[PDB]
């Protein structure tokens, strides 16, 4: 939905989510008019512009929280 719990393994990201969720707040410090509308299509214009490097180091982060979520969420649900 948006935030089940801090200790619970929320939805797994995938590089892009790690970059956008971390770059969006940066765009706000310099772009006050950057509303969710332009903020959604702005961070994307940069990601596609980057070569095969922006998704090299920030892509392994989404592969570490998936080995604990796929195994921990099985018992966290129990419904």
UniProtKB/Swiss-Prot annotation:
Signal peptide: none annotated. One of its GO terms (biological process) is innate immune response. Residues 9-77 bind DNA. It is found in: Nucleus; Chromosome; Cytoplasm; Secreted. Its main location: nucleus. GO terms for molecular function: cis-regulatory region sequence-specific DNA binding; DNA binding; DNA binding, bending; double-stranded DNA binding; four-way junction DNA binding; non-sequence-specific DNA binding, bending; protein domain specific binding; single-stranded DNA binding. The modification Phosphoserine is found at residue 14. Keywords: Acetylation, Chemotaxis, Chromosome, Cytoplasm, Disulfide bond, DNA recombination, DNA-binding, Immunity, Inflammatory response, Innate immunity, Nucleus, Oxidation, Phosphoprotein, Repeat, Secreted, Transcription, Transcription regulation. The modification Cysteine sulfonic acid (-SO3H) is found at residue 20. The modification N6-acetyllysine is found at residues 4, 28, 55. Residues 2-64 are annotated as: Disordered. It comes from the Eukaryota. Both, HMG box 1 and HMG box 2, show antimicrobial activity. Interacts with POU2F2, POU2F1 and POU3F1. Component of the RAG complex composed of core components RAG1 and RAG2, and associated component HMGB1 or HMGB2. Component of the SET complex, composed of at least ANP32A, APEX1, HMGB2, NME1, SET and TREX1. Directly interacts with SET. Interacts with LEF1. This is High mobility group protein B2. It comes from Sus scrofa. The lineage of its organism: Eukaryota, Metazoa, Chordata, Craniata, Vertebrata. The gene is HMGB2. The chain holds residues 88 to 165 of 210 of the full protein.
């Amino acid at each position: 939905m948006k935030k089940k719990d801090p200790n619970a393994p929320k939805r797994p990201p995938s590089a892009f989510f790690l970059f956008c969720s971390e770059y969006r707040p940066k765009i706000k410090s310099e772009h006050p008019g950057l509303s969710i509308g332009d903020t959604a299509k702005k961070l994307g214009e940069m990601w596609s512009e980057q070569s095969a490097k922006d998704k090299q180091p920030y892509e392994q982060k989404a592969a570490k929280l998936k080995e604990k979520y796929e195994k921990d969420i099985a018992a966290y649900r129990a419904k």
